[PDB]
Amino acid sequence: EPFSLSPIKDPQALHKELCSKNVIPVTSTLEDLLPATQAQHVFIKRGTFHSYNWTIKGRSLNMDRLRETCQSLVDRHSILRTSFVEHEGHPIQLVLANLDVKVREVQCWPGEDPMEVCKALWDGKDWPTLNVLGGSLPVRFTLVSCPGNEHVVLTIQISHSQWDGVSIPKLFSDFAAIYNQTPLPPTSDFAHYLYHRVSSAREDVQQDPTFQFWRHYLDGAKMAVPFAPGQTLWTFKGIVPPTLPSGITMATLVKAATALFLSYHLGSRDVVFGHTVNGRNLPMDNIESLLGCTLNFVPLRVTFPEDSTDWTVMDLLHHTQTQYTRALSHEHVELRDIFQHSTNWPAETPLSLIVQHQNIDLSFSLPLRGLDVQYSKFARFDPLDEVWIFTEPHADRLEVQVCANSRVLGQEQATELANNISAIITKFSTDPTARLLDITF
Ligand SMILES: [Cl-]
């Protein structure tokens, strides 16, 4: 029920106070006001900002319905109508209604490439002036036309606190839908997800199944704490896709490689690092389809036996995977809650390393009809104190991607990390029965 989780005492006072400052349309009505998730704050603090671009060539294109769809798409999904301000220190998200979407449009000189115009607006003003926490609505649309409207670029701009890998194909789905004027099953929105989390919590916080699970799961764990800390480095390594042992997910293989690597350099038989879970394992409907950012970043814990036990790669793989699936029904809570209620660590403890495998959709489609549609994007992402390892399963390649600021992880160290991890994954694939101690890297 609307406003039941607002930290602000009079929400709509804050609303028109923004309307007055010309931040948000004065025609807009304040629907709800909830706090932002820790994961949301994570992305906003890192300037995670996206422009999904579609190059539409063909004789059909209805520019006016293209414009309609943008209004409609935004009407459907409350999160696309969300504005972020930070009053007191942690962010709140204000949801908007009665809000009509205006599209930025560009008619190019003859011969002027539309994508280049987009790139220019992007680097020129779009992202260098970005100030999501200021309240300006982050979702916004651009339409760049060749002289005759038969070569056009459509770009959606969005903050990662508003989408995830699970639901972003749904944004392109529901968009291509509305243009083709095709039925859509009603959807939930992201605020309803937040509500649904609060209810399935408990009266007593240490009576909660979930904060009881985490306390049991992290009993005796120690997190390694990096040393003293520039620019953002992306370091890549591609390999042959691993041949998975039966029962073993690709993300399991990846997360176990990381554990092995950490155990070796940390000289520890018990390691804890962060990984990304999709956060959609709640008993609610449309949770498969509702648009928003349900991703969470939670401890993955991997514990190795004493050397006498003489474990193999397969032991490690099976252990590592249940150390993930054990958490499925508990993976939706705030990280700070897990640390506050279930551990002795400061509630504001960061994850220093986050492994994120996307067994999600790497390819995107915007199927519009009477039309050649290409996909492409621009993206900003700028890590703080932490190191990211992203893995993507392509046809030709599994791609390991390390992302960290160079003040944290220099190119040589970033290169070695990507290489070493990739090599471990390959060895795991090769002889899944190898003794762990016969492993070199
Ligand atoms: Cl990202």
Pairing of strands 353-357, 270-277: parallel
Cα 268 to chain center, whole Å?
Answer: 30
Write down which residue in 182, 203, 224 finishes a domain.
203
Q: What does the alpha-carbon distance between residue 217 and residue 339 come to, in Å, rounded to a whole number? A: 12
165 has binding-site annotation: yes
Closest CA to 36 of 159, 213, 206: 159
Residue type (1 letter), 267 = G
Tally of structural domains, the chain: 2
Query: How many CB atoms are closer than 10 A to CB 214?
Result: 23
For 227, the token pair is 């040393």
Same domain, 110 and 121: yes
CA triple 416-420-424, angle to 5 deg: 175
287: CA distance to ligand 1 center in Å? Answer: 22
249 has binding-site annotation: yes
Same domain, 31 and 175: yes
The CA-atom distances, in angstroms, between 331 and each of 275, 299, 429 are 11, 9, 28
120: CA distance to ligand 1 center in Å? Answer: 22
* Dihedral sign of CA atoms 311, 317, 320, 321 in order: negative
What method did the depositors use to determine the structure?
X-ray
Contact status, residue 425 vs residue 432, Cβ threshold 8 Å: no
Write down which residue in 137, 172, 203 finishes a domain.
203
Same domain, 153 and 170: yes
Same domain, 159 and 242: no
Three-class SS state of 106? strand
Same domain, 163 and 214: no
156: CA distance to ligand 1 center in Å? Answer: 16
Query: How many CB atoms are closer than 10 A to CB 222?
Result: 12
Q: What does the alpha-carbon distance between residue 173 and residue 185 come to, in Å, rounded to a whole number? A: 12
Q: What does the alpha-carbon distance between residue 390 and residue 259 come to, in Å, rounded to a whole number? A: 15
Closest CA to 1 of 160, 191, 156: 191
* Dihedral sign of CA atoms 292, 296, 297, 303 in order: negative
Tokens 């809000």 sit on residue: 99
Please report, in angstroms and rounded to a whole number, the separation of the first and last CA atoms in the chain. Answer: 55
Three-class SS state of 295? coil
Sheet holding 82-85, edge to edge: 29-35, 92-97, 82-85
Same domain, 74 and 98: yes
296 has binding-site annotation: no
Same domain, 236 and 199: no
195 has binding-site annotation: no
Q: What does the alpha-carbon distance between residue 258 and residue 272 come to, in Å, rounded to a whole number? A: 10
What's the length of the chain?
A: 441
Tokens 């995670």 sit on residue: 48
The CA-atom distances, in angstroms, between 22 and each of 28, 97, 135, 290, 308 are 11, 16, 10, 30, 68
Three-class SS state of 84? strand
Per-position b or e across 395-421, b if 16+ CB within 10 A of its CB: eeebbbbbbbbeebbeeebbbebbbbb
237: CA distance to ligand 1 center in Å? Answer: 17
Closest CA to 107 of 143, 79, 81: 143
Q: What does the alpha-carbon distance between residue 152 and residue 165 come to, in Å, rounded to a whole number? A: 26
405 has binding-site annotation: no
Q: What does the alpha-carbon distance between residue 155 and residue 115 come to, in Å, rounded to a whole number? A: 10
Listed as own residue / partner, the contacts of 205-208 with beta carbons closer than 8 Å and 24 or more positions apart are 205/341, 206/341, 208/341
Same domain, 196 and 48: yes
Cα 27 to chain center, whole Å?
Answer: 31
Using left for φ > 0, alpha for ψ between -120 and 50, and beta otherwise, residue 172 falls in alpha
402: CA distance to ligand 1 center in Å? Answer: 11
Contact status, residue 290 vs residue 190, Cβ threshold 8 Å: yes
47: CA distance to ligand 1 center in Å? Answer: 10
Domain interval for residue 99: 1-203
Same domain, 154 and 230: no
Q: What does the alpha-carbon distance between residue 343 and residue 337 come to, in Å, rounded to a whole number? A: 9
The H or E element containing residue 29 is: strand 29-35
Q: What does the alpha-carbon distance between residue 94 and residue 132 come to, in Å, rounded to a whole number? A: 12
Residue 278 CB-half CA count within 13 A: 19
